[PDB]
Amino acid sequence: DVLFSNHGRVAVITLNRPERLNAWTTPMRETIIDALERFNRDPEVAAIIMTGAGNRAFSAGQDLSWVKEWQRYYTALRSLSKPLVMALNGTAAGSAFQVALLGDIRVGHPGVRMGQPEINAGIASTTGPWIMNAMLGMSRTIELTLTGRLMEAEECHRIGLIHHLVDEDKVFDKALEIATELAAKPPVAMRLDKQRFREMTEPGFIDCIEAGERI
Amino acid sequence: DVLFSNHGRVAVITLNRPERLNAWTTPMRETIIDALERFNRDPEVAAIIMTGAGNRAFSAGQDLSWVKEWQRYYTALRSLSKPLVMALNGTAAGSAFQVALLGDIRVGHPGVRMGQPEINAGIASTTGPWIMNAMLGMSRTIELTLTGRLMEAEECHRIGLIHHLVDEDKVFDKALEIATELAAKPPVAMRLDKQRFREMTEPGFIDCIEAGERI
Amino acid sequence: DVLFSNHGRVAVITLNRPERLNAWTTPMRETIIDALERFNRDPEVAAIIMTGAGNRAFSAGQDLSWVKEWQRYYTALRSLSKPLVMALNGTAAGSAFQVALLGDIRVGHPGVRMGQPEINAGIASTTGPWIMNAMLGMSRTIELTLTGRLMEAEECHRIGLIHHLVDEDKVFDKALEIATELAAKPPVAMRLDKQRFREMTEPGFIDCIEAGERI
Known part of the structure; x- marks a missing residue:
């Protein structure tokens, strides 16, 4: 399950499979993809928050129970013309680490770990390294990819991956406050800025999609 | 007004519109462009410092009283074969933040803020993000661009934008001492190093110029 | 001289010209190149450590008693399908700084300095800046290249060049422990990950080789 809500003009996506540490399944991604495509044209909606349920994980990544449907999710996140805030209520690992890093802004708390442990399951990585x-x-990047280690929150924040560290119980409010502030920016300059970030990174994104079929 | 001086073989450009926080006008940029083109062939001149007048701002950016003439300034800064030190006597915002970052070396003091607040005036950004x-x-970059926030000096220094933080009253002397040290490097290796930095960044520079017409 | 040893399935290359601060000569590089090409197909070998002899230097760089043979060394380091750990027993300067940065993982101790002082000898730099x-x-990069300064260990570690700082007498054990941990990763995912890093950086590598003939 995934939950949808609004807090004024901020749409909220809550990942809701807490007993599986909010690990992704294909129907969850399909639903999130549709919602992302609506919020983008939706006039009620000036910004978006994604967060997870509970206090252990934003998301553990892939449910341990194709590269194209994933590319469709990444593409839907890169297509937003509106700001996307990641309210990290806990650990973001594997493909969830990647999704978190496709947000504009990340907020977490001191117990949030992040990283890419794919190598330990014998999975070769292309999107993560990009x-x-x-x-x-x-x-x-090399050390993170070959170790597969999870970084602590403080390291994430110091190297610039997490923009705000707050108390666990404030993560969502801080996320809302940021999303509200970004919702107030002039919409045309926002959309153009976001399109510019997309264009700057698009060749590298294409390259690692194509490296993904191959590898 | 802009002032020109020399301290031995170091040419100094001082931005001198203090009552407007050294905000750029078109005649100031035209003059600075000419000076930059002379210092580059000038044999008296082994290095260059840019600084601003007073203690509030290096420069506030655009006087609140085209993308091509700006490109001509950026191009004149990128063309130097001689070292360019930024003596940041105060805050560098908007297009002044960009100019500051086209210097080789930056020196500031603890009250120097830096950033790009263009989004709050509804301006879409292309050069800054590049x-x-x-x-x-x-x-x-994304967080800085979408928030439009000014970073404090300590943050600038920690993430590598400011190379030396010193007491406000030492900023210029430290700038001179660095410029003097770089003036002493073998000139051929200096010029070739600087040409190499230009070549490494040129495709991205072209790309964001062209994105600038469009956007 | 260069020494070769094994510690279980970890091959060890020790640079052994301590009276010349392990500065490179052409026969040392020729030998290291051959060894790197063997370890890569060798089935006994799951990872590789490079380190230097003594306690003053990993390597000082070029013996103060062509750009193609160097390119052949860089290419042999980039070709490994197996993890390469740099046990930095002391300072890595000039071309040794570059070799150190072509390792996957770096371990040092608090007296390790790193950098590129080439400009002070009138040498223009292309590989280093890349x-x-x-x-x-x-x-x-610009400040490091134009100053030619050596950074202290703590700076190297804070900006992400050194992954682990330990006591001088623990550098090799920490290097072995990391190399052992990386040796245990699934080999196919390791090789594919490393090939991916190579592919991501290859255009920039080609560019700076070609800039090297010219410049």
């Missing part, structure tokens, strides 16, 4: 490098450069 | 990303990666 | 920028962005 996105991590575009934010961190090749030295952090 | 330059910020080339130094900071996409996570800091 | 690699430093891919890890650090253009602001740190």
